[model samples]
Target: ADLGHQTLGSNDGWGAYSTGTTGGSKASSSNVYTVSNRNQLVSALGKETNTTPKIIYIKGTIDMNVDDNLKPLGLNDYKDPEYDLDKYLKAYDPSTWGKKEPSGTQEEARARSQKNQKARVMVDIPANTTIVGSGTNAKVVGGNFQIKSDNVIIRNIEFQDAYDYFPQWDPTDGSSGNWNSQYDNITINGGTHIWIDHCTFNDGSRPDSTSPKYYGRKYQHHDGQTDASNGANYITMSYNYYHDHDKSSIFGSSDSKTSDDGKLKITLHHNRYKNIVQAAPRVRFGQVHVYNNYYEGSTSSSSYPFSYAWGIGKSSKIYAQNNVIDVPGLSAAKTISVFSGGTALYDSGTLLNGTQINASAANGLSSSVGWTPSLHGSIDASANVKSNVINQAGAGKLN
Candidate 1:
């Protein structure tokens, strides 16, 4: 009304658009391409081929390794008996990457592309392209998908599997160390004015905890389900489902806080997180608004501690409001977690355990949105969101 701009998503949260989120509309004569398999999907996603605004329609399982035949390896199946990280001991040491240890063989760098060479496999979406799935059957399987360009929309799609079986151990991560997995199911790295709606991201078959516990810590063979970093801005993530993985979605790239702090802004509304162990979006340095979302617990035993369902870290100004969380073993104190640095998290209006609603130092419980989204469809309340957000968030639900 006052801003004189068309809005996106819900009228309540930061995900509500400020202006101009018309992705791939072409508005006039946008060409539509149908994708069923690997090659067709790849060719359609090329920046040169899809420079103009267009719609990429997807059907069935558009798997990258479908033509390459590199079905991901697993534990009991012994598909890739060499999937163990023990062979790359030198690479595990920080000296391999940062060059402190002399015996470092650079094995992690050498084998980085190997997706087990599935790591190297990924699909790129060009600028101003709308990637939409026909229905629940339209799934993009087996590889990480990246959007490097601006003004794109991905809707009604299932991003499945997308794992990096061989992750390098970084000895310098902390006192305990950490595994570095490269790719995610969907990454909006260095892109702007994007929207990801009605999608599902999951581990599919292999779990990060399935590596037989050679390393005492859970070696994540995979990364986040979805993330936006490298200065990605103005994103609206609505009505999606993320399950069965760790490091679910991070807003800012881990170390890019200086350059990306202001520009990595994003809005996530009415999404559902299930079973994912940590980083139900561990974020850094950005203006992220997470509101009206749903988080549910999973029975899968995890090596990870019961971290908070929502994370606000490293100068990120997050206004989390009106969200619902239902984890049986977790308390309200543990549900809203924070990392050091950054402003005291601005959390409010979050409902936990059906009763107690709660945040950091101040900004209180109910946060105010800068701009209200005037235009939108339907969004469920946080209370009945178990079935509403999970069962009805993603594909096959007709809009």
Candidate 2:
């Protein structure tokens, strides 16, 4: 059958590109499932220990924020009885509470509220699994797809609005206070040999801009559209669309997590990143190959905040090539940001606003990254990237 098994190309991305990622191809007929709702999806995934290959087909829109009866759940549904939003905000207000980490009864109640939501929204994808959308409009709403194992393939689906009801405010997080959320649309932690292709991720229904503010800052709810970290290696994210989000993709979790040095080798190609503020993606201790992607910045509007595209974090070796950026008024220097203790970002044949710019020379980055990519398909010209990615990327576009 067509749904049984699939394989990645011989030359796709980085080191793991040619590694056999045959998710669920060897599963028996009884192990295969077609899921259209939350309960069925949970059952299809099976237990964490069940590493037997299985193919799961997602048929319709599955709303993860739902009751057991498949009814849509609201904020009050996920709230604990003792957790009141008004009182929680007033108690943890940074002005009166001063610059300190949240604690005490209010903070404890907030944790409980978050836990209540997590019980309903978070779904785990086991290893040796193939998850594909059945048709054009297969969607997952308000869901966090966490991959904790290896050999997984996800394709042709739309992941939208993975919201966190209880986002903690850290007064000492940065120079200014920052509201940190706990969820991403998809997170690959310690997962290896994974392929994510032809998917669409966006802040649909509940956008962060519409969120209310407490303590003089916009209450940030969403974390990342997709993040791969915590020893995650041999992954390829291709032909995906990231739209209307603040933070897009993060390769590594933290700067101090230097254990990711040899791991976290990822390939991002033919993706369309539109109107994302920053971190498309921010790398740390990863040898990431970013090529043939399209980045479209926002117009002068408060709705779409624009920051630098590539974040060069600690001990990162990024080989950026053949990418097109059509962000008007954003200079080539603003496209790349080197964090403290970061070096080695080689860029060649990158176009900015229809003109070729030396990304390595413009930002004083090193052209030599000590390694060359032996894997990956044909490289497109920078001038053709925008048109090719627009036509071929995102859900329902894959053959």
Top-lDDT structure, candidate number? 2
Q: Looking at candidate 1, what is the lDDT of residue 130?
A: 78
* Best candidate according to TM-score: 2
Q: What C-alpha root-mean-square deviation, in Å, does candidate 1 show against the real structure?
A: 5.5
Model 2, span 1-399: residue lDDT tens: 463367666687752464557778788999899999999999899789879889998998999999999999987888877888788788878778888888888788889999999988888899889898887888999999999898888888999999998888888877778889888889999888888889999988888779987777778889898899899999888999999898899999888898998988999999999988889989998989999999988647577577878898888888899999878898888888889867778889989998899877887877887778878899998878999999999987853
The sequence of per-residue lDDT tens digits that candidate 1 reaches over residues 259-362 is 88677777787788877777766777777777778887743455333356767677666766677787776656677656666444556566666764554533
TM-score of every candidate relative to the true structure: 0.82, 0.97
